[model samples]
Target: TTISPHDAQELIARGAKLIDIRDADEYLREHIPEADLAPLSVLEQSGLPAKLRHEQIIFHCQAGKRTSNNADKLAAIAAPAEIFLLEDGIDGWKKAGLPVAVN
Candidate 1:
């Protein structure tokens, strides 16, 4: 599934967990508001946080590659849960003029 930046923003507002599948360093550098860090490199080891497991989860990356990979892997492990990817990712969010945070 895919969500627009506006929808992603609303998701965050409505209690969705946005997971950033980039490195921790990149996550701290700049990331979506309310997003949790889960870099793709150790995604399986990172383990999806319990608070987010049963909720609508959105994943994104700098472009799209990493997040796409992580989202699929996560869903395979945690079925019956809603998992979506932000098409165009950070670029899409920024292009939509949505809020972003930087460390």
Candidate 2:
């Protein structure tokens, strides 16, 4: 499923886990304050965290492109998990005036 930044924020407030699937450097440059890094490359190798195995997880990248492209990996890990793709990624988050963190 894909959600707008506003919807993402609402889900996040309800405890949804936001995963950033961009490269490390890109994530370090900017990301949602509540997001955790899980670069698509490494994630393909390590899989998801145990806690997230059955939780609602939303994935994003710089734009929706990467997240949309790699969404299958998320589903493969935990079929039962509720997965959401940010409609426009962090770029949309910023456009929505959501808080962003920088390293």
Candidate 3:
């Protein structure tokens, strides 16, 4: 299932984790739910912690470009993880009538 910022909030409510795939600078500037900063550039190299990877993971960014690119890649390495690419990303979030916190 896809995730939006509103869904991010819901996931957070139902115990889902948010992973921000943008670069460090972009993430630091503005991110959803104070999302866990996991830059996409390094995802293919390293990976998220094994413990967290076992749960639902919502991958998002300013647009859907980067997150969509990483979804399958992350699922491959994260085993037993459900990675969702937020449609339209932050754009979709705003379009859905959600709010964002910026730096």
Candidate 4:
């Protein structure tokens, strides 16, 4: 399921881990505060950690394209734990007045 930036903020406050699936370069350029980079490409080989399968995880990309498009991959990785997508990606987060981290 997808969530607006506002709701994402709520989940994040409650210990949800935000995973950024964008490439390293894109991630380095700008990303959500506290979001961890896991580039979907890398997960193809190692797969997401089984340990995190039950954790609250929210995935996002530049504009919701990559994350939404590859939601199945996350589903396979996260299993029983529900997966949340950041609607409109970081772009929407910024529009919602959320802070972002820049390298």
lDDT winner: 4
lDDT of 3 by residue, 1-103 (tens): 5765666777767777777778888866766754677777677787677645637777778778866666677677556766677788877886887767779
Q: Please provide, for model 2 over 8-102, each residue's C-alpha lDDT reduced to its tens digit, 9 standing for 90 to 100.
A: 88888888888888888887788788888887877788877776553688888887998777677767855677889998899999998889987
Candidate 2 TM-score, C-alpha based? 0.89
* Ranked by lDDT, top first: 4, 2, 1, 3
Give the Cα error of residue 49 in candidate 4, in Å. Answer: 3.1
Which of the two candidates, 3 or 4, achieves a greater TM-score against the reference? Answer: 4
**What TM-score does each of the candidates earn?**
0.83, 0.89, 0.81, 0.89
Model 1 has an lDDT value of: 0.77
Pairs clashing within candidate 3: none
Evaluate residue 95 in candidate 1 and report its C-alpha lDDT on the 0 to 100 scale: 90
Against the unseen true structure, what C-alpha lDDT does each candidate score?
Answer: 0.77, 0.82, 0.72, 0.83
Task: Give candidate 3 misplaced runs (Cα > 4 Å).
Answer: none
Per-residue lDDT over 1-103 for candidate 1, one digit per residue giving the tens place of the 0 to 100 score: 8888898888788788887778878878888877787776666766665765756888888977766666668676445668888888888888988878978
In candidate 4, list every pair of residues with a backbone clash: none
Alpha carbon lDDT at 42, candidate 3: 76
Q: 1-103, model 4: which lDDT tens digit per residue?
A: 9999989888878888788888899988898867888889888878776544436888888888988888888877666666899999999899999999888
